[PDB]
Every structure is written in structure tokens, then in C-alpha cells.
Ligand binder design. Structure first.
Ligand SMILES: CCCCCCCC/C=C\CCCCCCCC(=O)O[C@H](COC(=O)CCCCCCC/C=C/CCCCCCCC)COP(=O)(O)OCCN
Lengths: 71, 59
């Protein structure tokens, strides 16, 4: 009547099983990374140049007010 | 059949040397590891709520 029934793989077997190492490269050349670093450094230098010159002018103004008040 | 695990030879052209120098000076692989840990924080934990939940058993 009944037939044999035990744990077996399904007909045709199972699907493929990945085992190879997969460490993909995100990707950015050393030249590009160094260029981005240098570019942001240059932008910061320019911004600080303008701001510190403005600060010098403000300090000179404050010094002038003090000089006017001294006598 | 046998495999080699550590038998690679780094390229000595200017671009590859510059890439390795950028890795040394800008910590690219350290940021990559930080990135995996960050990604891994944003997924569901595997913890079950014992004793209100129980681990699977069998007959
Ligand atoms: C045109 C003029 C421009 C002016 C000059 C500017 C040029 C700048 C170009 C180079 C600057 C890069 C320097 C930055 C730091 C470099 C230091 C460094 O590279 O040290 C590493 C080592 O550095 C480390 O590995 C330390 C890591 C410790 C673990 C901490 C992980 C931190 C990484 C996550 C991100 C951290 C964020 C930092 C910024 C936070 C901001 C508040 C080298 O050591 P080794 O690879 O072992 O080999 C040396 C022997 N040959």
C-alpha cells in the first residue's frame, strides 16, 4: 500500500549555493581622494583669509574708538 | 586540488602606489569597517523575549 517516505532532496536537486568570497571595491582613485582633500583645504584657506581680514578691520575700528575715548 | 590564500603581488605602477598611499593616509578600510558596523546596527536584533518567548525545540 504505502510507499517509502523519508527525507530526500526535491527532484532536480537544490539551487546553487554561493560560496566564493565577495568583497566588492567601492571605488575611488587615490588621485581623486587627494584632490578632494586639497580642494576642501584650499576652500577653507580662502574663507579664513577673507574672514580674518574682516576681523582685522573690525579690531582696528574698535581700537580707533578706544583712542578717541582715551583723553 | 589546492588553493593559494596569500599569493598576490601588489602592482608597482604609480597609480597603485598612490592608491595604497591614499589608503594609508586617509584610512579608507577603517571607514569601510565602520560602515559595515553602522549598516549592521540598522537591522532587526535576533533577541527573543524570554521567558515570554521560547527557543524552538523538537520532539
Ligand atoms: C598644498 C598644501 C596643502 C597642505 C598639506 C596638506 C596635505 C595633507 C595630505 C596628508 C594628510 C593626511 C594626514 C592625516 C592623518 C595621517 C596619519 C596616518 O596616516 O597614520 C596612519 C595610522 O593611522 C591609524 O591607523 C589610526 C587609526 C586608529 C583607529 C581609529 C579609527 C578612526 C577612523 C574612523 C574615522 C575617524 C574620524 C577622524 C576625524 C574626526 C573629526 C573630529 C599610518 O600608520 P600605519 O598605516 O600603521 O603605517 C605607518 C608605518 N609606515
Amino acid at each position: 500500500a504505502s510507499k517509502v517516505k523519508q527525507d530526500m532532496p526535491p527532484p532536480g536537486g537544490y539551487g546553487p549555493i554561493d560560496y566564493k568570497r565577495n568583497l566588492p571595491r567601492r571605488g575611488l582613485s587615490g588621485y581623486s581622494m587627494f584632490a578632494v582633500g586639497i580642494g576642501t583645504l584650499l576652500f577653507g584657506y580662502w574663507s579664513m583669509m577673507k574672514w580674518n581680514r574682516e576681523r582685522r578691520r573690525l579690531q582696528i575700528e574698535d581700537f580707533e574708538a578706544r583712542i578717541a575715548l582715551m583723553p | 586540488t589546492y588553493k593559494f590564500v596569500n599569493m598576490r603581488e601588489p602592482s608597482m605602477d604609480m597609480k597603485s602606489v598612490t592608491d595604497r598611499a591614499a589608503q594609508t593616509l586617509l584610512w579608507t578600510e577603517l571607514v569601510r569597517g565602520l560602515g559595515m558596523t553602522l549598516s549592521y546596527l540598522f537591522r532587526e536584533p535576533a533577541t527573543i523575549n524570554y521567558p515570554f518567548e521560547k527557543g524552538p525545540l523538537s520532539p
